[PDB]
Design a protein around this ligand. Structure first.
Ligand SMILES: Cc1ncc(COP(=O)(O)O)c(CN[C@@H](CSC[C@H](N)C(=O)O)C(=O)O)c1O
Ligand SMILES: Cc1ncc(COP(=O)(O)O)c(C=O)c1O
Ligand SMILES: *N[C@@H](CSC[C@H](N)C(=O)O)C(=O)O
Ligand SMILES: [Ca+2]
Ligand SMILES: [Ca+2]
Ligand SMILES: [Ca+2]
Ligand SMILES: [Ca+2]
Ligand SMILES: [Ca+2]
Ligand SMILES: [Ca+2]
Ligand SMILES: [Ca+2]
Ligand SMILES: [Ca+2]
Ligand SMILES: [Ca+2]
Ligand SMILES: [Ca+2]
Ligand SMILES: [Ca+2]
Ligand SMILES: [Ca+2]
Lengths: 301, 302
């Protein structure tokens, strides 16, 4: 028995790739779309809220407010439904309408900004929204240690346990950098020889080239006006990238060939991993790819 | 949770207690079949129908799988056929949530549509035409295949028994084929002879309770093949429960608002029928299990 959907967060499956040629290495996909809120962000939503509760920062009528590209808003929305907290989310208009559908299904209010101004514009609008709230809590996934700490405590430990401490490579898409950084931190503490790589959009190559641009790999990319504090670049063994169309194409390869329905970033992260496997062919590596969310919310895309 | 393929994620779904919505002094647990990798309970029947036909020698590498579905059986078949590399053709009514066609095509399915006004009967009739154009095929036929109710008899029911440590007073399940109701209820009544088991049908298509059909919006539920499906076993029904379209939508919304459970329209219908039952039997401490057939994401566009 689960006492609520909160008890279903985490413990997500790790699935082997069987039909796609992975070049003499084994690739496993950790399916964070299996979380009740359908993304890895259920983990950080829960930890940011639960630690804030313990620190006395959240009363029953505290309005939670967060800037998000969608999934952190959804995770927060589901958790706030269970906890009976009021949530307001600021997000860009460029993101999939299904993200909005999902947040509103849980009773969350959504405020929209111009997506051509990036997540920076979301954060600016959030400052305006604070002025009208008597009592609020901003989790701030861009700075909150409990974003990467969630992954350090659960996501990484699950990877280690399911693969019996035999993991050679971990590859993960980045937006805040929290899932990459928290998970890689724990993996590296337990497995000193593991290689860990972040992925970013080829069209928004901030970490690899020093500049941003518009891209279509929803959830990935860094658009707050700098590298987020929760991204730990020292963990990156190299920066991997993926083009927009290649990410969409790989999303369909995974669903057609493996029955894995992941999001656009899953396509991006998996393409990057498969390219890595190919460059490192026939080594017998155990490679883990984080799939951040499920593909159902991208059918309109 | 290391899996060899997504097929290994089918089943072992969670039972969640209802905490925030008033349940009138009985305990209601929802079995979340939306946790399946294909997002519905139909993954269980897709797997068993395919695996049994494989063992029978009815599916070779080049056998085309052909099925009539309202969506979820097609999605479950599509996901499994993607892993197994079988060619799948699905016939569905054009009146269902348009996420269904997209989901199915994402897995490689060929989707053929029939006039929704004609119901599933039109889908089944269209299969006759598809069969003439194929050298090798297998039709799972969820409406007649005993491996539909047997999948639930074998897995769904056992998980309910295990998770509640054989303490189950009432089981309430929505119907379309009637397979999830009938297979689960059969097992439960074998192990617990005092358990009450109830199917739910749409109030505006009350075939079982009033002997006629009509239009309804509770996608996946209702019986529109031109009679009661062979896999429905009405001898298991302690009563027939119903739900109106508006109440099903209202309760779908209340579940997501108050419990963070995003179930489909039929989950709203089944849960509403369960709440009505629990109110009629208020404060008896009954342990009531409601099967949530699918998750709600595919309905949120309308
Ligand atoms: C979302 C949803 N809820 C309930 C059901 C009913 O489950 P059982 O079939 O009774 O185990 C379904 C099943 N959907 C089937 C079609 S059932 C027949 C049609 N409703 C009809 O004759 O009109 C499917 O996915 O094909 C379901 O999907
Ligand atoms: C779908 C999706 N992919 C990738 C990311 C990025 O994760 P992180 O914020 O941990 O970098 C997010 C957020 C997301 O919602
Ligand atoms: N996936 C996150 C957002 S990460 C940062 C964003 N991609 C950016 O452009 O800065 C979420 O909010 O769900
Ligand atoms: Ca306080
Ligand atoms: Ca609310
Ligand atoms: Ca160490
Ligand atoms: Ca190193
Ligand atoms: Ca390209
Ligand atoms: Ca199994
Ligand atoms: Ca009471
Ligand atoms: Ca045999
Ligand atoms: Ca195929
Ligand atoms: Ca095909
Ligand atoms: Ca009514
Ligand atoms: Ca809608």
């Amino acid at each position: 028995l689960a006492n609520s959907v909160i008890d279903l967060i985490g413990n997500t499956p790790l699935v082997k790739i069987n039909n796609i040629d992975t070049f003499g290495n084994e690739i496993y996909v950790k399916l964070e779309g299996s979380n009740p809120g359908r993304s890895t962000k259920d983990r950080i939503a829960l930890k940011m809220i639960e630690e804030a509760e313990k620190e006395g920062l959240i009363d029953k009528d505290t309005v939670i407010i967060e800037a998000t590209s969608g999934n952190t808003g959804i995770g927060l929305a589901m958790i706030c439904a269970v906890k009976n907290y009021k949530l307001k989310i600021v997000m860009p208009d460029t993101m999939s309408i299904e993200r909005i559908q999902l947040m509103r299904a849980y009773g969350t209010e959504v405020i929209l900004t111009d997506g051509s101004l990036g997540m920076k514009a979301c954060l600016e609008k959030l400052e305006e929204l604070k002025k009208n709230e008597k009592k609020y809590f901003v989790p701030n996934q861009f700075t909150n240690v409990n974003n990467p700490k969630a992954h350090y405590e659960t996501t990484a430990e699950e990877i280690l346990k399911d693969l019996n401490n035999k993991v050679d490579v971990f590859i993960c898409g980045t937006g805040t950098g929290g899932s990459f950084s928290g998970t890689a931190k724990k993996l590296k503490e337990k497995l000193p020889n593991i290689k860990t790589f972040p992925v970013e959009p080829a069209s928004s190559p901030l970490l690899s080239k020093g500049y941003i641009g518009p891209h279509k790999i929803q959830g990935m990319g860094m658009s707050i006006g700098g590298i987020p504090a929760v991204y730990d670049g020292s963990l990156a063994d190299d920066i991997l990238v993926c083009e927009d169309d290649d990410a969409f194409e790989m999303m369909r390869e995974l669903s057609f060939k493996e029955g894995i329905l992941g999001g656009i970033s899953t396509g991006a992260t998996f393409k990057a991993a498969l390219d890595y496997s190919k460059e490192n062919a026939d080594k017998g590596l155990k490679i883990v790819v984080l799939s951040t969310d499920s593909g159902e919310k991208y059918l309109s895309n």
